[PDB]
A and B are shown apart, each in its own frame.
Chain A
Amino acid sequence: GAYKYIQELWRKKQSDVMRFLLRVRCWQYRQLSALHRAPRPTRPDKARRLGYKAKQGYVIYRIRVRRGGRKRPVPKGATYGKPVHHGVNQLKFARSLQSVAEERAGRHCGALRVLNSYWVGEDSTYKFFEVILIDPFHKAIRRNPDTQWITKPVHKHREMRGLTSAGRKSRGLGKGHKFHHTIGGSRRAAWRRRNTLQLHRYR
C-alpha cells in the first residue's frame, strides 16, 4: 500500500525532498494563527495510526507552540528563600511541548474530545503539532460501537488530565523496575499509600 511508502518517506527527514517540504510548510504555518482549523491532516498515514478516521466528526487543528524551557514567573528573578530554590533560568516544564499543544486545542474546542496529536513542523522559535478531535455528539460517532467510548462522560478533557499519549509520557508510568514511583496508578497514589500509617484494631 501507499501508506508504507509515506511512512518510510517521513523517516528520511534529512533528505533533500523532506528538507524542502518541511521548510515550505513551516514557513506557511508561521504566517497563520497559533490556533487554526485544518481542512485535512497533513500526514494522513500518521493520523490513522494514531486513531484518526476519514469520517464526519473527526477534525484536525494545528497548534503553534513557543519552544524553550520554563522561566520562573518571579518578579525581578527574586525567589525568596534558600539557595536551592534560586533557579530562574534553566528550569524545565514537566510536560512536553506536544502536551501543551493538545491542552490548548481542547480548551478552545470545549465541545470536542482530544484523541491524539502528531508532529508536523519545527522552527527555531516554534514547534507545530496537529491534533485530532472528535465531536462526541455526531451520529456517525455515537452509533459506531468502536468509537462510543469517547462519548462517555469520563473522557472529557483527557488532555488536561494527562490521559492522551503525549500526556501519559510525562507521568512516568510503566512496568518494571524503572517505574516504581507510580506502582499504584500515579505518583500521588504511590506517595499516599507509602505515607499512610496503618493502625489496625488489634495492634
Chain B
Amino acid sequence: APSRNGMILKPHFHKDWQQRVDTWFNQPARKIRRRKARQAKARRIAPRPASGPIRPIVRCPTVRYHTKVRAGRGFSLEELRVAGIHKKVARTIGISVDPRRRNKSTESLQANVQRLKEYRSKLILFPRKPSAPKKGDSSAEELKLATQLTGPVMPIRNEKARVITEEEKNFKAFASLRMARANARLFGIRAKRAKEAAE
C-alpha cells in the first residue's frame, strides 16, 4: 500500500458513510425562507425593534477571550433592581432577563445598569388604548418619530505617551515573573516546613 514518502492517512470511511451524506443543495432555499421569516416577524411586531430584546454586556469566560465583550442572555436580577425595573415588567418593555446570572464585580454591574438607563430613556411607550393614554408617551414622540430599529439595539463593540521614570526603568520584568511562579509553587511546602520547625 505505501509507496515511498508520504503521509500516514487514516480516513474515516469504514462505516457505510454513503447512507448518511448531507448535501447542501437546499442551502439557498433555507436562506430565503429564513429571510422571509425575519421580514414577516418584523412586520408582525412592527414598532418593536425586530432584533429581539436588549441584551446585556458580557465578558467571555476564558484566558483566550477575557479581553473581549459580547452580548449575554439577559440582564441579571441585581442590575435590574439597581436600575429600578421590575423583573416581571422588563420582558414586556423589551428587556431580556437572566435570573441565573451572578455579579462578581461592580464595574460590570454598573456598565449594565447604565446600559439599562440608556435604553429606558431611549424607549417610546405606546398606551394600551390609543384613545385613552395614561402614564405613557406624548403624541409628538409617538406618531411622528417612531421607527423600527434595523440592527441589534445598542450594538456591543470591542494611552498618551509619557516620560519613562527611573523606577519602572529599573524593573525586572522577567525576574519577577520567575520568582512569582516559584512562590506559588513553593507556597504550601514552605509553610509546612515552617510549622514543623516551630514544633
CB distance from B19 to the nearest CB of A (A): 9
Q: Is A49 an interface residue (CB 8 A)?
A: no
B-facing mask of A183-195, CB < 8 A → 1, else 0? 0000000001001
CB distance from B164 to the nearest CB of A (A): 49
Interface residue tally on A, bucketed by range: under 10
Q: Is B159 an interface residue (CB 8 A)?
A: no
Q: Are B24's CB and A200's CB within 8 A?
A: yes
| B binding-site residues for A, Cβ under 8 Å | 15, 17, 20-25, 27
Instruction: Tell me, in angstroms, the Cα distance from A200 to B25 when the chains sit together.
Output: 8
Q: Is A198 an interface residue (CB 8 A)?
A: yes
B-facing mask of A162-203, CB < 8 A → 1, else 0? 000000000000000000000000000000100111111100
Partner of A192, one of B15, B20, B23, B27: B20
In the assembled complex, which residues on chain B have CB atoms less than 8 Å from the CB atom of A197? Answer: 17, 20-22
Q: Are B24's CB and A201's CB within 8 A?
A: yes
Q: Are A195's CB and B20's CB within 8 A?
A: yes
A-B residue pairs in contact (CB < 8 Å), sample of 9: A195-B15, A195-B17, A195-B20, A197-B21, A199-B23, A199-B24, A200-B24, A201-B25, A201-B27
Instruction: Tell me, in angstroms, the Cα distance from A192 to B17 when the chains sit together.
Output: 11
Most buried by B among A195, A197, A198: A197
| A binding-site residues for B, Cβ under 8 Å | 192, 195-201
List of 5 A-B pairs having minimum Cβ-Cβ separation, nearest first: A196-B20, A198-B22, A200-B24, A201-B24, A196-B22
Instruction: Tell me, in angstroms, the Cα distance from A137 to B126 when the chains sit together.
Output: 44
Most buried by A among B15, B20, B27: B20
Closest to A195 in B: B20
Given A195-B15, A200-B27, A201-B27, 9 further pairs, Cβ under 8 A:
A192-B20, A195-B17, A195-B20, A196-B21, A198-B24, A199-B21, A199-B22, A199-B23, A201-B25
Instruction: Tell me, in angstroms, the Cα distance from A196 to B16 when the chains sit together.
Output: 10
Instruction: Tell me, in angstroms, the Cα distance from A197 to B13 when the chains sit together.
Output: 10
CB distance from A131 to the nearest CB of B (A): 35
CB distance from B91 to the nearest CB of A (A): 21
Instruction: Tell me, in angstroms, the Cα distance from A192 to B16 when the chains sit together.
Output: 12
CB distance from A175 to the nearest CB of B (A): 13
In the assembled complex, which residues on chain A have CB atoms less than 8 Å from the CB atom of B27? Answer: 200-201
In the assembled complex, which residues on chain B have CB atoms less than 8 Å from the CB atom of A195? Answer: 15, 17, 20
